[PDB]
From a paper:
To investigate how these ligands adjust TCR interactions to tune affinity, we solved the structure of four APLs (A2-ILA3G8R, ILGKFLHRL; A2-ILA3G, ILGKFLHWL; A2-ILA8T,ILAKFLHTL; and A2-ILA8E, ILAKFLHEL), included our previously published APL structure (A2-ILA8R, ILAKFLHRL), and used the ILA1-A2-ILA complex as a model. In contrast, in the A2-ILA8T and A2-ILA8E structures, peptide residues 5–7 were flipped so that Leu-6 acted as a secondary anchor and Phe-5 and His-7 were in more solvent-exposed positions. In both peptide variants, the mutated residue was at position 8, distal from this structural rearrangement. Closer inspection of the structures did not reveal an obvious mechanism for this indirect effect on peptide conformation. The structural rearrangement that would be required for ILA1 to bind to A2-ILA8R (KD = 151 μm) was reflected by a much weaker affinity compared with ILA1-A2-ILA (KD = 34 μm). Both A2-ILA8T and A2-ILA8E ligands underwent a conformational transition compared with the other APLs. Modeling demonstrated that this alteration could lead to a steric conflict between TCR β-chain residue Gln-96 and the C-terminal residues of the peptide. However, the position of peptide residue Phe-5 in A2-ILA8T may allow for compensatory interactions with TCR α-chain residues Asp-91 and Tyr-98, which are not present with A2-ILA8E. Furthermore, the smaller Thr-8 side chain in A2-ILA8T, compared with Glu-8 in A2-ILA-8E, would require smaller modifications in TCR docking. Taken together, these structural distinctions may explain the extremely weak affinity observed for ILA1 binding to A2-ILA8E compared with A2-ILA8T (KD values >500 μm and 28 μm, respectively).
Residue numbers in the entry:
A (entry chain B): 0 to 99
B (entry chain A): 1 to 276
C (entry chain C): 1 to 9
The structure:
């Protein structure tokens, strides 16, 4: 009955250049309980080839997960991570900002 | 430097039907090497590092048999903890355990760990002497009495000071070309104009292993915590980590500021300054 | 490797 809202970072595995294959990550941490829904979005639409790491947790018992998919950024495409969790009123969306 | 081996176990009860969902992960330092998930098809302990693949099929038989006995222990615990706390069956609940050993830079036994939480809160933990228990409440006091009676602490001590330590050494030796390497961070600094009078310097640490790092801003040789922002260290997804720290500064004053990076792989601490 | 036994609470 103690609930912790997930923190979210959305970022690439490598310095982002266009037309260069890369990995889009959404790292979710600090949440409890473990049930959580994470989606990557491309111009709003959900991406289906999305893998994620094995559930583990920190010394305060809060959980963390890495969701990733291969992608190649381009000039116009906008990417985002979409998280829902019992803790949130509705989905929190976080945009991919390249310099972060 | 030192090294750790740790196992992590999470069990989530499924109230409508069937047994709990159980996930186990094994780590050496910051490198996951094995896992089991109750809802996967294999029903086996699976490799997650390439170097553990050199263990023969007995290893996988033994680790599968053990990890299955582990999920049954947590299944039975969920049901005892429901009664202890007098909870209904409508609610999903979670147990988490972590255990393991740390070795120093001579790889001898330094420290052992075995902790247990229920619904995200401490329940019971082996004290650092490894012969006694910290119980958080009266239900956990009941468990502590039972484990003192059945000499559980002493079995754990044999495992943590003996088996864990010998298998850690052996993995460091077989994962040698990744586990005993240290990857210093590739650092750089970026600039971004907030407005016509404020500017942001961000100091980047990329591609480093292990994950422990410190990033510190200074101004004219003195620590600065005001007008800064750290991010939690994050996995890159290729075994390495990232982190950055940033500071807001007045335009034209960028060269007063220096970013200091400390990391086990850097013989000496590194110092970044904007001015090229 | 994993512990050999894990006792119920």
């Amino acid at each position: 009955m103690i609930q912790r809202t997930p923190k979210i970072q959305v970022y690439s595995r490598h310095p982002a250049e266009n037309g260069k294959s890369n990995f889009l990550n959404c790292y979710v941490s600090g949440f409890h309980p473990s049930d959580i829904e994470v989606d990557l979005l491309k111009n709003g639409e959900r991406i289906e080839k999305v893998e994620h790491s094995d559930l583990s947790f920190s010394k305060d018992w809060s959980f963390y997960l890495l969701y990733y998919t291969e992608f190649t950024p381009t000039e116009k495409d906008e990417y985002a991570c979409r998280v829902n969790h019992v803790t949130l009123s509705q989905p929190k969306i976080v945009k991919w900002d390249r310099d972060m | 430097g030192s090294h750790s081996m740790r196992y992590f176990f999470t069990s989530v009860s499924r109230p409508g039907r069937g047994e709990p969902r159980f996930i186990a992960v094994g780590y050496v330092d910051d490198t996951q090497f094995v896992r089991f998930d109750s809802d996967a098809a294999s029903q086996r302990m699976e490799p997650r590092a390439p170097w553990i693949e050199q263990e023969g099929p007995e290893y996988w038989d033994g680790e599968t048999r053990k990890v299955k006995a582990h999920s049954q222990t947590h299944r039975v615990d969920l049901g005892t903890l429901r009664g202890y706390y007098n909870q209904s069956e409508a609610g999903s609940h979670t147990v988490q355990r972590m255990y393991g050993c740390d070795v120093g830079s001579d790889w001898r036994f330094l420290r052992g760990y075995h902790q247990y939480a229920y619904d995200g809160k401490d329940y019971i933990a082996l004290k650092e002497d490894l012969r006694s228990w910290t119980a958080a409440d009266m239900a956990a006091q009941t468990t502590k009495h039972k484990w003192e009676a059945a000499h559980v602490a002493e079995q754990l001590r044999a495992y943590l000071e003996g088996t864990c330590v010998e298998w850690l050494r052996r993995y460091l030796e077989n994962g040698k070309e990744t586990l005993q390497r240290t990857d210093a961070p590739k650092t750089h600094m970026t600039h971004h104009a907030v407005s016509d009078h404020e500017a942001t310097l961000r100091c980047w640490a990329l591609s480093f292993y292990p994950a422990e790092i410190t990033l510190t801003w200074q101004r004219d040789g003195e620590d600065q915590t005001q007008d800064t922002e750290l991010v939690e260290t994050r996995p890159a997804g290729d075994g390495t980590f990232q982190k950055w720290a940033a500071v807001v500064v007045p335009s034209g004053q960028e060269q007063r500021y220096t970013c200091h990076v400390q990391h086990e792989g850097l013989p000496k601490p590194l110092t970044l300054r904007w001015e090229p | 490797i994993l512990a050999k036994f894990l006792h119920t609470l």
